[PDB]
Amino acid sequence: PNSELNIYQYGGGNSALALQTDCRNSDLTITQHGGGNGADVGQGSDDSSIDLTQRGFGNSATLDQWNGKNSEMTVKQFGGGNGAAVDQTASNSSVNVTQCGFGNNATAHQY
Amino acid sequence: PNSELNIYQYGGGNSALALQTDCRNSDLTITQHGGGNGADVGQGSDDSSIDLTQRGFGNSATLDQWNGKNSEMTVKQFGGGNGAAVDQTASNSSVNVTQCGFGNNATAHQY
Amino acid sequence: PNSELNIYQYGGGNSALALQTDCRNSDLTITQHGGGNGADVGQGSDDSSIDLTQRGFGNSATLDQWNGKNSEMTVKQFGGGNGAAVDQTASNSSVNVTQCGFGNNATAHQY
Amino acid sequence: PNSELNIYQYGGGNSALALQTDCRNSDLTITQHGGGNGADVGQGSDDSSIDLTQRGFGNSATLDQWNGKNSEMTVKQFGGGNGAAVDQTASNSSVNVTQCGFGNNATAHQY
Amino acid sequence: PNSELNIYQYGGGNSALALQTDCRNSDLTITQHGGGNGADVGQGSDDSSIDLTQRGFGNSATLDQWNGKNSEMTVKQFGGGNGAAVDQTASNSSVNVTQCGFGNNATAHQY
Amino acid sequence: PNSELNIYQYGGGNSALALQTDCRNSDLTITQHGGGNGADVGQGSDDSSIDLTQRGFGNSATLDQWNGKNSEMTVKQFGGGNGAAVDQTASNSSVNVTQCGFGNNATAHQY
Amino acid sequence: PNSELNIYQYGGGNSALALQTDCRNSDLTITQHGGGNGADVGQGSDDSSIDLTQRGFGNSATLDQWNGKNSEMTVKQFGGGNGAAVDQTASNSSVNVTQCGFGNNATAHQY
Amino acid sequence: PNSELNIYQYGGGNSALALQTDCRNSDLTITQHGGGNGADVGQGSDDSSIDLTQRGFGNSATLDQWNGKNSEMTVKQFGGGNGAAVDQTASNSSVNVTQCGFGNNATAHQY
């Protein structure tokens, strides 16, 4: 059971919360480029992947993948002030979020 | 159940909210080109597809895929300020909604 | 049941409402060219087809196909301000309404 | 395998790398307060904990916990430009690093 | 094997080098007060202790405790520029170094 | 074997060399008060003690306790520039040297 | 064998050389008061005593106990430049030498 | 064998030569008052005594007591430049020499 959590933070003013529990063979990566991006990621699913990359300024993300299996979730934010929340509990399922520009709001739920 | 939810944003000021639940072997894709388009997509149908594409400005869409099976959704806006709302519950059914121009309103239902 | 609802707008200020229920293996098609054309189409007929084409300005059509089977409705306005109201319940029947010019009014009923 | 990795950055310009694999039931905690602090932490040890606290600016610590069991590693850097390098492979073992001030360099290896 | 390594540095410009390997149930403590103090301490001895206290400036002590058991090594440097070099390999043995003043040099070997 | 070696230095510039090997259940104590005191003391005798007290400045003494048993070694140098050389090898023997004043030299041998 | 050597020197420039070997339960006391007194005392006699007291300046004494038993050896030199040479081998014997003044020479042999 | 040899010199320039060998239970006493007085005394006589008293300047005495038993030897020289030569070998014998004044010469033999 290899669980991997990576937090890559470049620039100034980025802040991160990352959480894995009961998630076997799961990968969760946080990469922040720029400034002021705040991150909160929860992973509790086996054989699942969470990939959160922030490039820009002022983006905020809340990401929860629970009780799933063989699930891939991706959130990529480019630009400024974009806010994302992703909840994924479906098994063998994928959620992909990519927001480019300013002030974009995205909410994704997969059960 | 291989379920994919895709949000691709190009431009500035677009907003999207996506819902996919109890949804086996189906795809939900939201693509916006331009600015200020607003979207709300709920998909709960097995072996189904929703394709919502916005190219232009100020278009508004609401899409609901519920309790169906083997159903297809393709909803397209070209231009400005087009507003569409579609409810589809029929199985083995498809609704293909397109607007070209400005200020067009379309309502579609399938049961 | 392969049932399709189609709405196409070209121009500006056109409005179309389409409702189709209990209508199996049937097509709903609306095409509006120009501006200010208004459409209200109800389809509840099995193995039936509705084709409404408005080309021009200010044309209005109210179309209802209920309880029929193997029925076809083709309503076409060319010009300005033409008004059509057609109600069809007969099975294995076809009504074809065509208006050319300005201010034409046509009512068709088939039972 | 409840394996948790937390990294907290408050301020701007901090850099931290955290790596957890082959590491069951283990916690890796990074807390960076200020700006420009550097951290590289690798964790591959069972039932182990890593705690890193950098408070100030420009501090450096390179931290490796591999192959160990029931092992705790603590480093607390207070001030500016402080350097500590700690490798841990010993089981049931602890290393405590406490740097206060500017330009401090102290290295510990535990096997 | 509850083995603890502690370093306490107060002031600026102090350097200490500590090594604890294969070293079960043992403690290594370094306490530097002032500035520019240097210490090199290696510990490879079971159930052993190393206590080093440097208070002042420019003090240097090079300490090695290897292959011993139940061994205690104490060095206390008070003042400036003091040097003590001690190697301890004997088991159930104790070394005491006490330097007060400036430029003191005392060397101890215990086998 | 409880073998404990003590060096106490008060002032600045005092120098002392102490060596304890194969010397079981023995105490090695050196006391230097003042400045510039030089001492070389080697102890390899079981159940033996060496007590060296230098109070003043520039005192020099060489003490060797080898191969003895139940032997006590005492040297007291008070004043300045006192020089004493003592070798003790006999068992159950005591050597006592007291120097008071300046420029004293004393040699004592016990076999 | 409780055998002790005592050397007491008060002032400056006094020199005393003492050897005790093979000599059980025996005493040697050297007391030098003043300056420039020279003493050479060798003892090899069981349960024997040597008492040398030099008070003044430039006094010289050479004292030898070898192979005797129950022997007592005394010289008291008061004044300046006194010279005493005593060799003792007999058992149960005592020689008392007392020099007061300047330039005294006294030699004692007892076999 | 309590055999005790005593020299008492007062003043400056007095010289004494004394030898006591094979001489058990006998006393050797030499007393010089003044200056430049010379003494040569050899004692090898059992249970015997030699009492030599020189008071003055430049007095000379040579005394030999050999092979005798229970023999007493008295020389009292008062004044200046007195010379006495006495050989005593007889047992149970007493020789008395008394010189007062200047330049006295006394020779005594007892066999």
Author numbering:
A (entry chain C), B (entry chain B), C (entry chain A), D (entry chain D), E (entry chain E), F (entry chain F), ...: 41 to 151
Quote the authors verbatim.
Curli, a prototypical functional amyloid formed by IDPs, serves a pivotal role in bacteria. Curli fibrils, widely expressed by Enteric bacteria like Escherichia coli and Salmonella spp., integrate into the extracellular matrix, promoting structural scaffolding, adhesion, and host colonization. The curli system consists of seven proteins encoded by two discrete operons (csgBAC and csgDEFG), which regulate the assembly of a major structural subunit, CsgA, and a minor subunit, CsgB, into curli fibrils. Using cryo-EM, we have shed the first light on the cryo-EM structure of E. coli CsgA fibrils, revealing that the amylogenic regions of CsgA adopt non-centrosymmetric beta-helical structures.
We chose an engineered CsgA with two designed cysteines (A63C and V140C), developed by Balistreri et al., as this selection offers several advantages for structural analysis. The final CsgA fibrils for cryo-EM imaging were formed in 10 mM CAPS buffer with 0.01% Tween 20, pH 10.4, without shaking, and heated at 70°C for 30 min. Acceptable initial 3D models were generated by using box sizes of 218 and 260 pixels. The overall architecture of CsgA fibrils illustrated that seven and eight CsgA subunits could be assigned to the map of 218-pixel and 260-pixel box size, respectively. Interestingly, we also discovered two major spatial arrangements of CsgA fibrils in class 2 (15.5%, 120,429 particles) and class 3 (25.5%, 198,126 particles) of cryo-EM density generated with a 260-pixel box size: a 3-CsgA-fibril bundle and a 2-CsgA-fibril pair. Surprisingly, in the 2-CsgA-fibril pair, two protofilaments made contact through the sides at a specific angle of approximately 34°. This contact likely results from the attraction between uncharged residues on the sides of the fibrils through hydrophobic interactions, while there is repulsion between negatively charged residues on the front and back of the fibrils. The distance between the centers of the two protofilaments was measured at 37.6 Å. Additionally, a less dominant but distinct arrangement, the 3-CsgA-fibril bundles (class 2, 15.5%), also formed at a specific angle (62°, 44°, 74°) and interacted through the sides of the protofilaments. Due to the limit of map quality as a result of preferred orientation, the real resolutions (around 4–6 Å) are lower than the reported values (3.6–3.8 Å) by cryoSPARC, and therefore, the detailed interactions between these molecules within a fibril need to be revealed by further higher-resolution structures.
